[PDB]
Structure formats: structure tokens, C-alpha cells
Design a protein around this ligand. Structure first.
Ligand code: HEM
Length: 393
């Protein structure tokens, strides 16, 4: 297991979050690696940990630094954006801010709608019951990312299988995951070679142009970013989408969106808040003693921010354990905050919105085909979600 506390059979939070928010807001936690870190669970603390300039990400690559998981995985690549500090991080963050500008993401809206229509159309004209994960919530983000990256349809499954292997640290050995990452990268390098200089207007072309014309990305940064964007845009989105649809169906609030589609934008934010798929996040190393709202974290003592625990803090969210698609106030931290705020947040939010728009439009009578306790879940602190979501109509 890679769960933060006891592995859980559903999407409910571990009781230690509420216990800690009440009586131990900044206390050590033993991570799956066996190393310790300070677990921040209150929203005020997590928000400061994510936004303060007095924390480092690159310091966690040092040999004696705490690690979240046992082994030497791929979050140790010094060319990964999540492992960088300013000024290097600043340069690449500025490149990505232009590439993912609201104007540029809006230009990708039609492809997002086309892929969503295709997959919902296939469900609606097919047999029932169906597993909505295999037929929709899993394929949709990876197909979108593959389209935006100029990947042929025939290769989407390889990308899905490679990503699943690389992120499933407890399911495959390091040799297997290293091998998949080597294929992934190798494919992406050949993709760039066949794509560069041909005048496309996709995400992949904007990344290539940043390297070739701007000289604002190195070759290793370009290749690593392209792989990361695919992996992040696929798994995290797919997990939030499956968790959110399961919760909509179990609470009966799917019907709320069918009858009042104007609620879908607040529903997307509430799904992000309530089904935040990572109980824990990337560690932050204090580069000096940092005064947080609940206490001081010492220089050199790494902090785990829990965005999921922050997302249920009653100081910020009234009735935080209630799922309410009409919730007006929803400043969740599911996309993080500060320097490493999700670079794809606009695209991810739009995908979720269009998924719910299209499912409720085409399949208004959708309902669970099994009792929710028959569904198996992933357990790990970096990504939890249901394995299947059987539905019918
Ligand atoms: C629902 C979907 C998603 C969620 C909940 C999510 C969440 C996050 C979070 C929490 C972070 C910051 C991690 C930290 O600071 O420790 C992050 C970073 C990032 N996300 Fe997203 N993500 C989602 C979708 C996407 C999509 C669609 C893309 C790209 C197409 C993307 C690209 C990135 C990248 C590149 C970073 C690193 C930014 C940096 O370190 O400067 N994500 N994401």
C-alpha cells in the first residue's frame, strides 16, 4: 500500500485528517517510504505552504531528503517542472502560461467537444449495463491529450498502458516502469521529429515552437514536459471524473444537473473539492523557519501539504463533509496554489464541464447498476479513485 493512513474502501477521507485539523495541525506523519514529514491539513496552513517563497521543491532531489514512496522513481528527474525552483521554474512557467492561455485553450474547445461526443455517443448506442470507467472516464482525458499532442488514434492505448504502468508504483517493478518511461520518451522524441516545422496549431506544436523559435525550452525540458503533460492530463482528470460521476450518481445529484444544467459549473468545482484525488502532495522543503498560521515549520524539515484535507476544512467550507453541487463558495486547492499551480487547470475544468454537459444531455436517466459498496478503489495517497463505475439507463 501507498495510502497515507489506513487504506480505505471508498472515497471518504481518513479520520486522521479531522483529528489533526482539530488537535495536531502540523505534526509528523510516516510516509510509505518510512521517512517522516510534517503533514499540513488545515486550509490556512496548506495554502501558505503552497504559496510562500520560503519553500523549495528542488531540495527534495538531494540525497538525504525525505521521499514519499520507497525506491528511486521518476519524480527525481531534475528536468521535471514539479522538481524546479525559480529562476528556472519561472522561465518554464511563463512559457506554459502563454501556451495554456485562455485564448489558446478556447481554440481547443472544438476538439474537446468532438472527442466527448464520440465517447458518449458510443456509450449511448451500445449495450447496457456498461462500466463507465473503461468506456468513458478513462478514455476521454487520454484521447484528448493524444489529439492535442498529434498522436495517432492507433497509439492511444500504448500511451494509456505506459502511463498506468509508470504511475502504479505498487503494481509493477522499477525495471518495468523504467522500460515504459523509456518507450514513452522515445516515442515522444520521434513524434516531435515528425511534427516539428509542419505548421500545426496543436499543443505539441506550441511546445516545439517554444524550443525552436523562442529557445525558451531546452530539448530535455521539451521532451519531459510533453510526457508529463500527457500523463497528468490523463490520470488526474480521469480519476476526478470517475470519482465525481460516482458521487453524483450515489447522491442523486446527477438528476439535479439533468433538470437544471445551469448548475454544472458549480458542480464541477464541488467535484474538484470533494473528490480531490490525492490525500497528500509533493513535499515542500522550508529553506528557513517558516511561520504558518498554526505554528512554525523548521528549516530543513519537509512539509506534506494535503490539499484534500484543506478542501474539507470547516473554517473555509461550511458543512465541509456535505457534497452539494449548488455550493457557491468553493475555493478548493485541488489545482494547488502558488508557483506550481496546475498549468492545465483551464483545460481540465473545461473537460469536466463538457463531460457533465454531454452525459446529462444524452443520458439523462443514467444510474448506478450496482450498489456502491461493490466497487473497488485505488488506495494510494497520490491518486485514489474507483476501479469501475457500472451504470445503466
Ligand atoms: C482534474 C485534473 C487535474 C488536477 C486535479 C490537477 C492537479 C494538479 C496539482 C494539485 C498540481 C500542483 C502539484 C503541487 O504543487 O504539488 C498540478 C500541477 C501541474 N499540472 Fe495539473 N491537474 C489536473 C489536470 C492537468 C491537465 C489537464 C494538465 C495538462 C494538460 C496538467 C498539467 C500540470 C502540470 C504541467 C503541472 C506542474 C506545474 C508546475 O509544477 O509548475 N494538469 N496539477
Amino acid at each position: 500500500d501507498s495510502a497515507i493512513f489506513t487504506p480505505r474502501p471508498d472515497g471518504s477521507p481518513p479520520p486522521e485528517f479531522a483529528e489533526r485539523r482539530a488537535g495536531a495541525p502540523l505534526a509528523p506523519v510516516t510516509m510509505p517510504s518510512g521517512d517522516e514529514a510534517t503533514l499540513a491539513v488545515r486550509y490556512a496552513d496548506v495554502h501558505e505552504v503552497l504559496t510562500s517563497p520560503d519553500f523549495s521543491r528542488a531540495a527534495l532531489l538531494a540525497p538525504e531528503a525525505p521521499r514519499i514512496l520507497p525506491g528511486e522513481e521518476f519524480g527525481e528527474d531534475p528536468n521535471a517542472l514539479t522538481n524546479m525552483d525559480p529562476p528556472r521554474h519561472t522561465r518554464i512557467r511563463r512559457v506554459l502560461a502563454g501556451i495554456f492561455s485562455p485564448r489558446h485553450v478556447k481554440e481547443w474547445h472544438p476538439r474537446v467537444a468532438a472527442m466527448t461526443d464520440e465517447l458518449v455517443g458510443a456509450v449511448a448506442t451500445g449495450e447496457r449495463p456498461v462500466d463507465l470507467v473503461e468506456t468513458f472516464t478513462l478514455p476521454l482525458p487520454i484521447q484528448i491529450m493524444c489529439e492535442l499532442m498529434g498522436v495517432p488514434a492507433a497509439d492511444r492505448r500504448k500511451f494509456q498502458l505506459w502511463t498506468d504502468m509508470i504511475i502504479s508504483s505498487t503494481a509493477f517493478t522499477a525495471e518495468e516502469r523504467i522500460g515504459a518511461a523509456g518507450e514513452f520518451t522515445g516515442y515522444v522524441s520521434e513524434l516531435i521529429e515528425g511534427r516539428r516545422g509542419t505548421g500545426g496549431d496543436a499543443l505539441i506544436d506550441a511546445l516545439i515552437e517554444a524550443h525552436e523559435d523562442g529557445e525558451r525550452l531546452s530539448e530535455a525540458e521539451l521532451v519531459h514536459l510533453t510526457v508529463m503533460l500527457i500523463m497528468a492530463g490523463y490520470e488526474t482528470t480521469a480519476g476526478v471524473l470517475a470519482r465525481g460521476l460516482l458521487t453524483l450518481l450515489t447522491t442523486g445529484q446527477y438528476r439535479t444537473l439533468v433538470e437544471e444544467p445551469a448548475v454544472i459549473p458549480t458542480a464541477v468545482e464541488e467535484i474538484l473539492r470533494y473528490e480531490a484525488p490525492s490525500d497528500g502532495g509533493l513535499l515542500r522543503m522550508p529553506t528557513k523557519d517558516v511561520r504558518l498560521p498554526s505554528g512554525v515549520v523548521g528549516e530543513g524539515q519537509a512539509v506534506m501539504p494535503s490539499m484534500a484535507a484543506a478542501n474539507r476544512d470547516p473554517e473555509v467550507f461550511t458543512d465541509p463533509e456535505t457534497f452539494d453541487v449548488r455550493r457557491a463558495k468553493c475555493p478548493h486547492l485541488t489545482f494547488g496554489q502558488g508557483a506550481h499551480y496546475c498549468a492545465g487547470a483551464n483545460l481540465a475544468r473545461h473537460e469536466l464541464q463538457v463531460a457533465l454537459e454531454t452525459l446529462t444531455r444524452r443520458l439523462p436517466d443514467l444510474r448506478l447498476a450496482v450498489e456502491p459498496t461493490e466497487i473497488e478503489w485505488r488506495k494510494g495517497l497520490l491518486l485514489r479513485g474507483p476501479l469501475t463505475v457500472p451504470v445503466t439507463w
